[PDB]
Design a binder for this molecule. Sequence first.
Ligand code: 4CT
Ligand code: 4CT
Ligand code: 4CT
Lengths: 273, 273, 273
Amino acid sequence: AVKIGIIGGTGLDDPEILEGRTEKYVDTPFGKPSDALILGKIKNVDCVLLARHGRQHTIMPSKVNYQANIWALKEEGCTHVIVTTACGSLREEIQPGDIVIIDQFIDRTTMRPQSFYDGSHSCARGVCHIPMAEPFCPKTREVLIETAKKLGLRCHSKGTMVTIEGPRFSSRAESFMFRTWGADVINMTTVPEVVLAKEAGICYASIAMATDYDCWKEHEEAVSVDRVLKTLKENANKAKSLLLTTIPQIGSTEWSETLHNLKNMAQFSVLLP
Amino acid sequence: AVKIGIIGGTGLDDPEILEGRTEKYVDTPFGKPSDALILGKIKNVDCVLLARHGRQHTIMPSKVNYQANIWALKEEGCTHVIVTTACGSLREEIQPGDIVIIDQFIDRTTMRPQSFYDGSHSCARGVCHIPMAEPFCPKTREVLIETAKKLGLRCHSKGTMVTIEGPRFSSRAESFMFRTWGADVINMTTVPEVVLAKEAGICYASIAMATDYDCWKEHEEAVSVDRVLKTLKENANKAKSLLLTTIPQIGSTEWSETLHNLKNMAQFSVLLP
Amino acid sequence: AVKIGIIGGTGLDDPEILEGRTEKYVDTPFGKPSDALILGKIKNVDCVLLARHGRQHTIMPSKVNYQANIWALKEEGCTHVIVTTACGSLREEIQPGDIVIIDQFIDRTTMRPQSFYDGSHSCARGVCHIPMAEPFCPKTREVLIETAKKLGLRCHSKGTMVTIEGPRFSSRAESFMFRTWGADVINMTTVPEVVLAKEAGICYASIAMATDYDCWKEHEEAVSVDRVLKTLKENANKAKSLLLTTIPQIGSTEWSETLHNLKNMAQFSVLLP
Ligand SMILES: Nc1ncnc2c(CN3C[C@H](CSc4ccc(Cl)cc4)[C@@H](O)C3)c[nH]c12
Ligand SMILES: Nc1ncnc2c(CN3C[C@H](CSc4ccc(Cl)cc4)[C@@H](O)C3)c[nH]c12
Ligand SMILES: Nc1ncnc2c(CN3C[C@H](CSc4ccc(Cl)cc4)[C@@H](O)C3)c[nH]c12
């Protein structure tokens, strides 16, 4: 069965869009999810919705309960998780408003749990070393790409997200260094969400929306909260249209082989006594 | 009004120099400052002095209470914070003994709180994402530069500090990598001091004194505590003269616009419910 | 006297090999070592054996008690610590099965104590800033090199280990970035083991065994637990032969000057009140 966890800036909740809406507060072995899971049906496909920074944004990216979020989506039975994220563009040709279907990351985070297998829980015994060669679901990305071209939206079919610890924005020196590293976009939340998704055997893809060019331009104002907020307001419909047209397609594709493979990868990543 | 917090290796305390000296032990929402604040007047300008690693240097750079230090200077009413720091040179042309008026950093730290807005305190509610495009006060740096040329001291008008976690020094591989990154000087304390200063709406500049060339030279002894200590002893007067001649000038400049701008930046960085 | 702590994948325990075997559970100021120290004699040289991830591998590289391991070896009286480690090759010419006698590292770790001098213990008072220009014992490496050529084994006489936090493997973007950085091999345990060894005045060298090429190859399967495990099984005898032929030689060399120098370096790294 297809069940799609959706994380992020999605006005997808709900009434016209979400049929059979149910609000469910969840307690996981890793503590509390960011907010109540919102459960329902979007065009006859089972979905689960989750606001990353909580009821009206009160928790910093560093202190987001990533373990609880992923574990709670898996336990509802999600086979997919498709997320949305604001990001800074590190390249001229990724303009604010553009979607980037990222395919790689570089971790610049420092204070974040990145495994369920942390020694502390009976649900996750042993040590897990999960492969990250292909951090993002190949077939989901493809649908995301096909669908954005169907929508005639500006879109980059690939890209490397650098995830900074934050909550501060980058210095200029840092911005230029990530440029030399070959990173395309920058955020605060992609790691460890994607790593925990893979540990859980979930197919996970990210819709990244560029909102600013960070601070690397010498003659333009550098990123701020207010500039990200207004760009994000202007452009939020694109990520929303992309998901409404994507979700029909996911629920009408063959998935058993991808999910079987993802399950074995996660299974065989773990070392028991 | 002008009030200048001064952090670091400053024999500025006191008797000839500091008029109207007062020792004040402070308790902030973020715990204890590194040491008692020493309060007084240097050439008719209100100053506040603070030893970064405590009464006779007992705390590692990683465990320095950066939140408490900055918050306590702000609460005394500082409009400026000008700091001094030892550093390793990552370029031949920055010789030991040289001052670098840094203008950028690269964060290599890992275990450090970098925001007052951490979820825990009523004085700092919401999430703060502070811009870091220009981490250091433009007009203060300028005075620092003008004044060092007035002193005929060797000086670099700009520079990128890499801040390592420590307390160890860098491996050679690490030293060469920061070189390829375009870093000029290296230390253990610049981040998060500067980031917390900006969150507080304080104009903050750093006097960086090169003490060694780290370990990148193939045919010279690599950095050690004793080599830094003796270079620092030989060269400590330069940073002291620079501040005595700088402090008159700060207290005689126009500041209201810079501080208004810095206040709005900090104000508009924060997200409430 | 020579006493050699040996950490890692060593079937050196024991009966044919280890004379006068004794199992000793130890309590250090920094908590418990990874496992019981196994104590005895290998070709008439006093050795101490220690399994890094514990009795049948149950602790993640991030949560390994590095402070306890090193401190317990020092307190038994080790003058040397020679370790073995699996690693990913970041260069074509380092083939799986090859030994790399590493000589440098780059730290990509984030959540790890890296000093005994942490403020908390009477055995380690003050702040320690240990030089890392030459993180690995020069004369031990040399014996390791000479001995591998005597064994006619494939061997790289130098190399830069990047130590990632883990427990996940690297993304591809990350793999390529460490390549551009000039790293040769990749692991999860080298830092802070080597840094704590130096703080302790112990001569410390690493036998690194390449087990995989991580994920940088476009047309080969990326690293997994099972691929590392089988390569490691196939190649484990090489690291074992290298140590049996190395250990005679260490116990028959002049060491007093190296250890005196290493002791002064550690001594003079520390700042008391
Ligand atoms: N240059 C940049 N650097 C790092 N991250 C970002 C991001 C990504 N997030 C924006 C956000 C800061 S602004 C914002 C916007 C809406 C709301 Cl409700 C709350 C806050 C952080 O979660 C990271 C966009 N541009 C970035
Ligand atoms: N190559 C290098 N790398 C990192 N940091 C530094 C530093 C900066 N600090 C020196 C200092 C180590 S030596 C010292 C000197 C005086 C006293 Cl009272 C106490 C200790 C650390 O706080 C970082 C200088 N050279 C450096
Ligand atoms: N590409 C790579 N990246 C990071 N580390 C490694 C390592 C080094 N270790 C292997 C090991 C993962 S696989 C393994 C093997 C035997 C046992 Cl008993 C338990 C687990 C981690 O400790 C890091 C090899 N290849 C690596």
